[PDB]
Amino acid sequence: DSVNMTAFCDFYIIPRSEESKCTEYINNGLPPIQNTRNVVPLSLTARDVIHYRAQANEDIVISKTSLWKEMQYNRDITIRFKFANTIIKSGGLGYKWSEISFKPANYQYTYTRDGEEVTAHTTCSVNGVNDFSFNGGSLPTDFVVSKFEVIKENSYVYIDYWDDSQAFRNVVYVRSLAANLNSVMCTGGSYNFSLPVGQWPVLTGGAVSLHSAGVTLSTQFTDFVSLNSLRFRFRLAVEEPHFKLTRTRLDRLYGLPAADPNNGKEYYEIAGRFSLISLVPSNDDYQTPIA
Amino acid sequence: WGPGEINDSTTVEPLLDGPYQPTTFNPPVDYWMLLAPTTPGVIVEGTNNTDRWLATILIEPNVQSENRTYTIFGIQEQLTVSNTSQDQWKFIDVVKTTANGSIGQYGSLLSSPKLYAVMKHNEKLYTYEGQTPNARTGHYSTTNYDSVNMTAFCDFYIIPRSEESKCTEYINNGLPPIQNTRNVVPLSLTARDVIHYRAQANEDIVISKTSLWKEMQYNRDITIRFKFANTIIKSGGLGYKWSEISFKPANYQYTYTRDGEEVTAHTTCSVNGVNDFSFNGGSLPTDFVVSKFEVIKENSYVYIDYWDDSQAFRNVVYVRSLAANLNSVMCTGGSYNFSLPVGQWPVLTGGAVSLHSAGVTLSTQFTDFVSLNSLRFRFRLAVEEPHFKLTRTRLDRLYGLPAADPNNGKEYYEIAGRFSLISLVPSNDDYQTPIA
Amino acid sequence: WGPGEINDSTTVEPLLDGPYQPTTFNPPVDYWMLLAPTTPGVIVEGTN
């Protein structure tokens, strides 16, 4: 078991979980499959718009007139964040990790406001990505990372809500949804990379800032039931502290890494307010019958 | 506003380094090859195979005139040395012109941090040099400039001549990791919570009175044509490792007509579900290296931005529903060739995915002043593809759209359909007739 | 209510996990060393 072998050229290695494919390799040898299709396509062959002769364009009106109100809605806002992350191991010898993932935020909160129990949803996504990696070398004992997202201040973070409280759930066709928000500490922890020999690297640091930014509106649609969206256009920032990295040759990594902002932190609280001016038809106290 | 979408952008260029795998090599022209071992002794041999066979040794200081054995070109014999220097490490340059000839040791480089560069450049050869934090350059009129070859046992660094500065400071001291250009905070009030602590009687206030809101629908046609935009970013070094081959958005124009009236439009491509992938032909510098090919699988939707300067977009802003039946057509790809100074040029050719409309997407960007607009259609993509062509690759004939060339050589892709409408805008007066 | 999120990952699906130069194996025990030769001869030399 204390063997020490030396291969003098370009050769391949494989761990346990792929013994079977190694057996078919030494049985037939299958580098090539070169066809990512299952079978004769179990789908429609081709259905385009034949005969695009659209005839004379004629218009029919569905319904009669309507009565819509215009109210400004200034509501204080306490929406609470927690950056979701999932861990998926990557194959190799043990220092060969590639998969760091991002999942949308899934949390629910409870607050009181004028007696209403606050129900709201929070889901987060990040773009303007600032990915990174570690080239510890190429020898199978080297540090290997394929993607290591270090979110820098040039990134835009998308936060989406399905806010259940009716205060949020009475506003569609908003003429102008303005708001004010707060800042978050959004720190970061560290992980380790484990090939069964030697001390393991520590991606240390992480103390980043967030500040105010925009918010937008969008909607999707299916056949007869649509899809509404409360999309946020927020950008991450940077602050004074530097984030050291020890026992590594790639150090002073600046910004949030992709690994872990939980660190035992309860949540990421960003309070603020809303101010929505909405076209609304449901506040007509007018067409009431007699008696 | 113009088109609105930001899908993905992985810009990674803070690195000024990147080694190879320690082996033998045949360096091309116009670079420097920065070695970096951790122990004194032989590192690499200069080989030309016709006229000159160079050699060099790095030596630990403080060891005055002595005698050390060395395995020059795999053949060992006894050699004399000298370290009158006692602080920084010496790096002699054993200049030899024939393997059977005398062992001519030269060179007086004085540097502890154990890094030096020798590589072909400008149809000529030279060397760096240095004593203390005063690094200069050696001058080597080596006959047979043209056939430089390196045979080593430790790691290198690939680095051109054009930026002599950074390398001369590396050989001066070395490479501390990335360190700087992150402190910009012109945004802070104080303490983050003194100024808002309230809830204070939330949303309730009137802005405007109500009016009549009828519907005036406009059921006419719509047509769209497609093309994609790509950026190719490779990695540094000799020019074989590559990084980025994918799509990017871009604003495109058309002069349409509809209902007997001309129409002008804006369009910008945006695609969901694009799969990065490394078609790695081998990490070694004489093989095929691309960090990622962003490829398409049927998990790809369409967020291609679309615009129309017709009456339609001016009309429909408050849309509760808008459906159609667009021309579900086939989309293919083009052909592109990769540049490899030695070997055979790898290629990308083929690839096709068919679309089917799966919804619409309106979007409005509210600024602090105004309300930017945007609109998109959703197409779900099914593959019927000519099996990607890319030679000298272990992986071939993959499915989806090619990551390099969408031009397709043909005219365009036909996308067309009709529309209903729903809206509420000021209309004529029905108050004038309040009775049947 | 319907969300929107974009993220993707696809790395080594053929598990092509042996591109390496001439080696110095002191590896973790218990693997399978695929041989990828150009011309047969001496391929690997082992030592206790």
Author numbering:
A (entry chain Y): 195 to 485
B (entry chain X): 50 to 485
C (entry chain Y): 50 to 97
How do the authors describe this structure?
A single band corresponding to the 98 kDa unprocessed precursor form, VP4, was detected for the NTR-TLP spike protein. The NTR spike displayed the VP4-C lectin domain at the base of the stalk (4A pink), which was absent after proteolytic processing. The density detected at the base of the stalk in the NTR spike allowed the modelling of the lectin domain in the chain C, from the residue T73 to residue N221. While no density was observed for the loop linking K29 (red sphere) of the α domain to the T73 (green sphere), an empty density was present in the region between the lectin domain and the β-barrel of the C subunit (arrowhead). Although the map quality in this region was insufficient for building coordinates, the position and shape of the unassigned density were consistent with the 222–245 loop previously resolved by Shah et al. that directly contacts the 414–420 beta hairpin from the VP4-C stalk. The structure of the NTR spike revealed that α2-β1 and α3-β13 loops that connect the lectin domains to the preceding α domain and the following β-barrel domain embrace the body of the spike and firmly anchor the head on top of the spike. Actually, these loops maintain the NTR spike in a conformation slightly more compact than that of to the TR spike. Furthermore, the external α3-β13 outer loops embrace the opposite β-barrel in the body of the spike, mediating a molecular swap that enhances the stability of this structure. In this conformation, the presence of the α3-β14 loop prevents the displacement of these lectin domains, acting as a “lock” preventing further conformational changes.
The infectivity of rotavirus (RV), the leading cause of childhood diarrhea, hinges on the activation of viral particles through the proteolysis of the spike protein by trypsin-like proteases in the host intestinal lumen. The RV virion is an icosahedral triple layered particle in which the segmented viral genome and the polymerase complexes are packaged in a capsid made of the VP2 protein. The external layer is formed by trimers of the VP7 glycoprotein in phase with the underlaying VP6 shell and 60 trimeric VP4 spikes, which project from the VP7 layer, that clamps them and partially covers their base. This outer layer is responsible for the first steps of RV infection: attachment to cell surface receptors, lipid bilayer penetration, and release of the double-layered particle (DLP) into the cytosol, where transcription of the viral genome is initiated.
